[PDB]
């Protein structure tokens, strides 16, 4: 079967980090740091990893039963599958599927609805992905809203996330981080069945990411979020499952109306794009662009520079 | 170029009429109502209809500039397109892409950013698409909200759609009605453009819904969602503009474990799915269950019993 990407246009697809729309191609570099995130990690032969799923509006998303922490607004969330079955820690994955991949304050809403009645509430909420009370792993998080008497036990809560928040009397931008991982089981264990670091190998290769800018809810959060593959590609490798002949698919970035080439890439097998740049660019794209596959090549393909 | 349809199961798709993941098949009569959606529209060679866009996070979404009701705790917003382009009121759509389609009170946030210093907000807000200040195609909304002094105007404002509340009776469930349409430009002119109204047209068919659960944040709401196409296929008819051979695409639902065909069900090529069956009926479907197209058939095609 052969190996296609998908024909959508940058805007018109879907971070596979947050529920947001993609914004921008953008390439920087990455030797400072490890480039590690478990939602959006999927090989082109169609296999899902880290955290990754495939619905876009699930991902940051989570769904239990609440208890409220006494004398506090602080409620634990326990947590189930994204179908509301059990959740299972014992399964070879980090975290839940759509469980946040970054340290970082995301604000959101928590909603329940009562079986019996069908009454419902709706509250602010914040899920600090670096407390110690973050353990989605073992099956638990913590949430800070703005009650302390208004969720029941026993009832479906949901979290949908909205935004970031930064501590604004605090050095600006100095929170999200979005390549620092939570410590899914806390601070007394040790992530687990992460998908990998990636990096270029190539010389004069850089990752190339596709990039959104996450609504701020307060303060001056750092908003940046790149995703390795837009959600549309994970949800179209995972269906397509064609072989890969070779670890490298060539990529080419057409302006269909003038029909010509702006740019090559190498999308890899296990799941990340690589392009021929050095230092921090966001690419300069006619907005009706797609990216065409063309060849399997071998790792060692000499793209032409961006 | 041979027409298919998406391999995701049910469950790993999304309502095209609010971004929450589908739950269920149903169907049920449907002559109490006019049925005609205005997301989650499209053909299935590919043509977009009504308000219907392809991102499934932009559905409820609204983006624009805020300015403030002095005395209140309100805030009309004078709308843009979803990648902040000028909204065009002489468009020939009903309203701008991705607007609710049904009448009731959506909670969510509104957000914003300035671009000098990276400083952010958010706050509570419920749009009412019953009021009279819900004008979207005359290019404005009204916001009720818990603040009266945080926005800036003339910057880029976006309202992140969460749940459904229910207010103002004593009845419950009597809100959202998800039959009926807003009137998009209130009082100052009916509804255009719309795509249309759906009935089965053949003996002893129904419709078949993709239905979902919305979040509700207070009162008692009605939170069936019922639409007429997941927002995947609509994404994958889009991209693929497969030409329709008839008028009518015959999909079997098939368990892939078994190969056993649990019911057969036509999808129109206006972008709609009957079957065959007389009453209100939760269908019960195994959790890897799929539809496959098989065959374009003629209009004097009788479906097998469900």
């Not at 190996?3 to 921008?24: A, C, D, G, Q």
């Given at each position: 079967?052969?190996?296609?990407?998908?024909?959508?246009?940058?805007?018109?697809?879907?971070?596979?980090?947050?529920?947001?729309?993609?914004?921008?191609?953008?390439?920087g570099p990455s030797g400072a740091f490890v480039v590690q995130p478990q939602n959006g990690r999927c090989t082109t032969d169609g296999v899902l990893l880290?955290?990754?799923?495939?619905?876009?509006?699930n991902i940051c998303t989570f769904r239990g039963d609440v208890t409220h922490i006494a004398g506090t607004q602080e409620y634990t969330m326990n947590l189930a599958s994204q179908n509301w079955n059990n959740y299972d820690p014992t399964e070879e994955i980090p975290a839940p599927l759509g469980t946040p991949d970054f340290?970082?304050?995301?604000?959101?809403?928590?909603?329940?609805?009562?079986?019996?009645?069908?009454?419902t509430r709706g509250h602010k909420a914040t899920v600090s992905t670096g407390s110690v009370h973050f353990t989605p792993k073992l099956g638990s998080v913590q949430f800070s809203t703005d009650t302390s008497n208004d969720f029941e036990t026993g009832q479906n809560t949901k979290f949908t996330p909205v935004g970031v928040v930064q501590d604004g009397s605090t050095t600006h931008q100095n929170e999200p981080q979005q390549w620092v991982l939570p410590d899914y089981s806390g601070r007394d264990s040790h992530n687990v069945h992460l998908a990998p670091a990636v990096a270029p190998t190539f010389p004069g290769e850089q990752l190339l990411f596709f990039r959104s800018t996450m609504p701020g809810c307060s303060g001056y959060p750092n908003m940046n979020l790149d995703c390795l593959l837009p959600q549309e590609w994970v949800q179209h490798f995972y269906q397509e499952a064609a072989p890969a002949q070779s670890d490298v698919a060539l990529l080419r970035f057409v302006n269909p109306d003038t029909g010509r080439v702006l740019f090559e890439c190498k999308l890899h097998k296990s799941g990340y794009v690589t392009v021929a740049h050095t230092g921090q660019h966001d690419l300069v794209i006619p907005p009706n662009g797609y990216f065409r596959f063309d060849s399997w090549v071998n790792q060692f393909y000499t793209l032409a520079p961006m």
């Open positions: 079967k052969p190996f296609t990407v998908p024909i959508l246009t940058v805007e018109e697809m879907t971070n596979s980090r947050f529920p947001i729309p993609l914004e921008k191609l953008f390439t880290g955290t990754t799923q495939l619905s876009p509006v340290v970082g304050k995301i604000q959101g809403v928590l909603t329940q609805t009562t079986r019996g009645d069908g009454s």
